[PDB]
Design a protein around this ligand. Structure first.
Ligand code: HEB
Length: 232
């Protein structure tokens, strides 16, 4: 596998997540896939998102299946008591994910919140010309505040620009596409005033999908995870 991803900054030495290639072969978990670890379970050894699917709830909004995971879960070991609260979305048919995590979810105020994306880059190529993407975004998801918008990619010029809006929040991104590794990086702007950065990745043949995070250091409430599939 060729797993790539990123998470916004950790806020605590134990209450945090990190993304990367999954390492756990045990229970429902399989190594070698797009994964996440939490500091409260085996010092964040990562497990695969795919395996979490059959145990996660679903809230579908505007055609986006937001997956939700938190204790209690039948068959989860006691070591998992402090796993926290995950909201995450599978992007397309491949092993591509974006989402957020917090200690206590909506009921507790999304403490220790982080955003992330992670996916398998195997087989990724970039097409010629231009394409647009229907993108969804998550920031403290409560069931009715999903962000949505359109990103515009110009692969000939190496630009990715777009915006997401929802639940009173607007995030715009302006990034440069790196054709050597199909990543992108640039600025992010929240509600037209708050400066941050964007980092993300195209996945799949002919850039079938993308995922990324927009983060705002010193203004972290606006941190947003996003992803979507190419239009057509
Ligand atoms: C059922 C259901 C379930 C679920 C949902 C889960 C979810 C999870 N998980 Fe799991 N796990 C499990 C079940 C589970 N799990 C099991 C069964 C196991 C095995 C262990 C034993 O054996 O006990 C594990 C195991 C495990 C491990 C290993 C540890 C050691 O060192 O060994 C880890 C790290 C984890 C994590 C995790 C996470 C992070 C999550 C989320 C996100 N996990």
């Amino acid at each position: 596998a060729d797993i790539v991803g990123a998470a916004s900054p950790v806020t605590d030495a134990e209450l945090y997540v990190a993304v990367g290639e999954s390492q756990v072969n045990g229970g429902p978990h399989q190594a070698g896939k797009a994964g996440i670890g939490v500091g409260t379970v085996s010092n964040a050894k990562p497990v695969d998102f795919q395996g979490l699917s059959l145990y996660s709830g679903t809230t579908t909004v505007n055609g986006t299946a937001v997956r939700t995971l938190a204790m209690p879960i039948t068959g989860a070991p006691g070591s998992h008591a402090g796993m926290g609260h995950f909201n995450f979305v599978k992007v397309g048919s491949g092993d591509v994910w974006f989402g957020e995590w917090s200690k206590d979810g909506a009921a507790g105020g999304f403490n220790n919140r982080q955003v992330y994306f992670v996916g398998d880059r195997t087989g990724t190529t970039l097409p010629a010309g231009v394409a647009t993407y229907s993108v969804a975004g998550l920031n403290k998801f409560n069931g009715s505040n999903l962000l949505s918008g359109t990103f515009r990619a110009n692969f000939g010029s190496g630009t990715l620009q777009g915006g997401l809006t929802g639940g009173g929040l607007s995030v715009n991104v302006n990034a440069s596409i790196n054709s050597a590794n199909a990543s992108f990086a640039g600025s992010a702007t929240a509600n037209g005033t708050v400066a941050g950065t964007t980092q993300g990745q195209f996945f799949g043949a002919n850039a079938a999908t993308l995922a990324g995070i927009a983060t705002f250091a010193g203004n972290s409430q606006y941190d947003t995870a996003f992803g979507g599939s190419k239009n057509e």
